[PDB]
Every structure is written in structure tokens, then in C-alpha cells.
């Protein structure tokens with residue numbers, strides 16, 4: 298049923314830096330997530346250029362932003378390439394170990410947390426605002442899985458039996474009590490317009 302895994306030491310360490318460092322400019326989190334989705338959408342676009350049957354699981358390539366005031370969640374959905382069980386376990390497709398290193402050293406030499414994306418670990422920026430992150434994903438070559446973590450040193454991976462998604466990734470941010478601003482329409486609009494205004498995929502903000 299539910300398998301539990303430990304983060305590689307470097308990622309436990311990244312995640313603790315993101316949760317504990319005093320940093321007010323939390324909003325970059327959305328930019329990094331949206332940008333992860335665009336990369337996933339590139340990836341499925343490219344694959345499909347030579348094998349059009351990869352798009353059998355969904356031809357539309359888009360990103361949705363879904364706030365929910367009652368569950369206290371913001372969810373970023375894309376119909377990108379999605380992840381296999383193995384990529385999920387292996388730091389969600391990232392070079393997280395060396396990325397954390399190159400990040401760490403950028404911070405020694407002048408950088409700030411907003412540069413996180415440049416080291417291929419932007420995903421973890423979700424912990425700027427989320428206390429728990431759930432990631433549901435479906436790649437063509439595999440089943441649908443959910444990855445989960447309230448940080449703390451460990452993640453879980455189960456096969457997901459709820460709503461079949463087709464193909465792609467859903468990053469559910471279970472928001473911290475004091476960051477409910479990121480559920481506001483106006484606030485999300487502001488951030489998309491500020492940081493993600495030239496992303497090559499439609500981005501729909503859902504209403505409640």
C-alpha cells in the first residue's frame with residue numbers, strides 16, 4: 298500500500314533551509330512550480346513530435362491553478378509528461394543532490410532563495426508556503442501515483458486510486474495557516490502577471 302522513503306541528506310537539508318531561513322519574498326514559489334509544469338509540457342510536446350500517440354492520454358497542453366479556501370489548498374495541474382514511479386522516488390525527476398550543492402554554493406557567493414530554480418530544485422520552493430505537499434502524477438509508461446511529504450525527513454509514495462488524471466502532474470499545496478493570501482484570486486493574478494507572463498502555455502486560474 299504506502300511505501301515510506303527518506304530524503305537523501307542533501308534534500309532534507311535543502312527543505313530545512315527553505316522552511317527555516319527568514320525570507321519574505323515567498324511568492325517566487327508559484328513561478329518555480331508553473332515553470333516546472335512548462336518544462337514538463339515542453340517534454341511531452343517534443344516526444345509527441347515524432348510519436349503522436351504519446352498525446353493519446355490528452356492532446357491539450359495547459360496549466361491550471363486551483364485555490365480552495367476550505368481545504369486550504371492551492372493546486373498546480375499540468376498535462377505535461379508526468380512522472381514514472383522511479384522519477385517520483387528519484388527526487389521528482391531532479392538532480393536534487395548536485396542541484397542543492399550548486400545552490401548552497403550560490404548562496405555562499407551572493408545568491409538568494411529566489412534563484413533556486415537555476416539549480417533545478419525549484420520544486421522544493423513549495424515549502425516556502427506549504428506545510429504538506431501532495432503530488433499526483435501519471436506518465437504514459439506507468440500507473441498513477443501520489444507522492445506526499447510534510448517535510449520532516451521522509452516522503453511517501455502510493456499508487457493513487459482516486460480520480461484518474463489522464464497524463465501529467467498535480468502539485469497540491471496544503472498551505473500554512475499564515476499564507477492563505479495565496480488562495481486569493483487577486484494575489485494569484487498579481488504573481489502570474491509579475492513572474493509568469495510569457496509562459497507558452499495557457500494558465501487558467503480557477504474561481505471558487
Ligand SMILES: COCCCNc1ncnc2[nH]cnc12
Pocket residue numbers: 330333334337375377378379380388389390391417420465466
Ligand atoms: C523538475 O521538477 C522537479 C519536480 C517536478 N517535476 C515534474 N515532473 C513532471 N511533471 C511535472 N509537472 C510539474 N512538475 C513536474
